[PDB]
Scaffold this active site. Sequence first.
Site, PDB file in Angstrom:
ATOM      1  N   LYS A  65      92.994 -68.412  27.758  1.00  0.00           N
ATOM      2  CA  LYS A  65      92.977 -68.530  29.235  1.00  0.00           C
ATOM      3  C   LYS A  65      92.264 -69.890  29.794  1.00  0.00           C
ATOM      4  O   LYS A  65      92.537 -70.287  30.894  1.00  0.00           O
ATOM      5  CB  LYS A  65      92.367 -67.106  29.683  1.00  0.00           C
ATOM      6  CG  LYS A  65      92.110 -67.464  31.236  1.00  0.00           C
ATOM      7  CD  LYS A  65      92.053 -66.352  31.955  1.00  0.00           C
ATOM      8  CE  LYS A  65      92.545 -66.483  33.454  1.00  0.00           C
ATOM      9  NZ  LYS A  65      92.353 -65.228  34.335  1.00  0.00           N
TER      10      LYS A  65
ATOM     11  N   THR B 238     126.655 -64.639  24.984  1.00  0.00           N
ATOM     12  CA  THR B 238     126.226 -66.171  25.215  1.00  0.00           C
ATOM     13  C   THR B 238     126.507 -66.851  23.958  1.00  0.00           C
ATOM     14  O   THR B 238     126.538 -67.966  24.172  1.00  0.00           O
ATOM     15  CB  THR B 238     124.760 -66.148  25.745  1.00  0.00           C
ATOM     16  OG1 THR B 238     124.563 -65.581  27.107  1.00  0.00           O
ATOM     17  CG2 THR B 238     124.102 -67.498  25.378  1.00  0.00           C
TER      18      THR B 238
ATOM     19  N   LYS C  67      98.894 -60.784  26.662  1.00  0.00           N
ATOM     20  CA  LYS C  67      99.702 -60.698  25.456  1.00  0.00           C
ATOM     21  C   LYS C  67      99.095 -61.341  24.296  1.00  0.00           C
ATOM     22  O   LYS C  67      99.444 -60.901  23.276  1.00  0.00           O
ATOM     23  CB  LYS C  67     101.106 -61.025  25.948  1.00  0.00           C
ATOM     24  CG  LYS C  67     101.513 -60.336  27.376  1.00  0.00           C
ATOM     25  CD  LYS C  67     102.959 -60.900  28.023  1.00  0.00           C
ATOM     26  CE  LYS C  67     102.737 -61.278  29.753  1.00  0.00           C
ATOM     27  NZ  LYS C  67     102.542 -60.329  30.691  1.00  0.00           N
TER      28      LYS C  67
END
EC number: 2.7.7.7
Length: 327
Positions: A52, A93, A64
């Site tokens: 962080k 895709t 997470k």
Amino acid sequence: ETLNGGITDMLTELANFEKNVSQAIHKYNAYRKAASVIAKYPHKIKSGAEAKKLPGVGTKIAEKIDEFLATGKLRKLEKIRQDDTSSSINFLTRVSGIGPSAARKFVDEGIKTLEDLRKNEDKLNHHQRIGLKYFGDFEKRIPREEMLQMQDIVLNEVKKVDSEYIATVCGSFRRGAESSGDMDVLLTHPSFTSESTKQPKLLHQVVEQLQKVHFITDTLSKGETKFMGVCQLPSKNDEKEYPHRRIDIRLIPKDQYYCGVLYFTGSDIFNKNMRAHALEKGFTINEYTIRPLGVTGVAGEPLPVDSEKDIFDYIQWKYREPKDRSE
DNA sequence: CATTAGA
DNA sequence: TCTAATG
Ligand SMILES: [Ca+2]
Ligand SMILES: [Ca+2]
């Protein structure tokens, strides 16, 4: 490169999904800088909090991060991996004509499967059709051994129509690749250059040539500078037909080959690196031209090129065989 | 980052 | 015209 891999891959996986499965450009754009920064960090991030500290890493990615850490897994990640809808989307895709909007669309249409797509061929446009038509052959690789025959042929016809034609089979092939995923032809002609207002046909001539001869067999996308299609190798005295390959021909102004030429052949890192150097060496490189710097910050004036060497001669480097252009 | 389709 | 998909 490995001390923070999990954090990155976990993270891309996190980006990628928002991208496609959801319209989260942002969140998706999110996992991407973060997954990029943590990618850089020299040390093993042992905690969210640690992580962080980084740029682009708010409360969010960190969270997470800790879960990934503790437990060898992630929920979100476990759930999507499980998510059929979203699975579907990843799947469709793979279809050479289908992008995110489409896949999401058929999906809501109820077409999630390959088969499902067949049942509704109508719903697919020309691209999506061919794409649907050479799905098996789209996914396979082009043995250089084939690249081999393939190149030849094409140089074969090009010389034919006109002898003033210069083309090259740019990319990994050009660079020795034991295999290539598609062929890429970088083409020019003296009578075509930056100004001399085209001659689309310049493109068009060859297109029709390679056609008349059968090699080309379809048309994915035609323009007056950028052809994009499908090709095939003449299935021998039977028993061994060739598979269907994508292929792309492109017209360029004589006066900007070598770069473009240099330029596609990569490698991705060889480009950037030779490129960085050019900055030192007081130059400016780009897909079409090389420009000499000017202290003011930037400068203009594209130097005159003649072959790969000229680019090199300029920044004062060792001529590098494409061979060893790996990095 | 630019080209082409297509609606 | 813009939006989409490819490189
Ligand atoms: Ca921060
Ligand atoms: Ca696709």
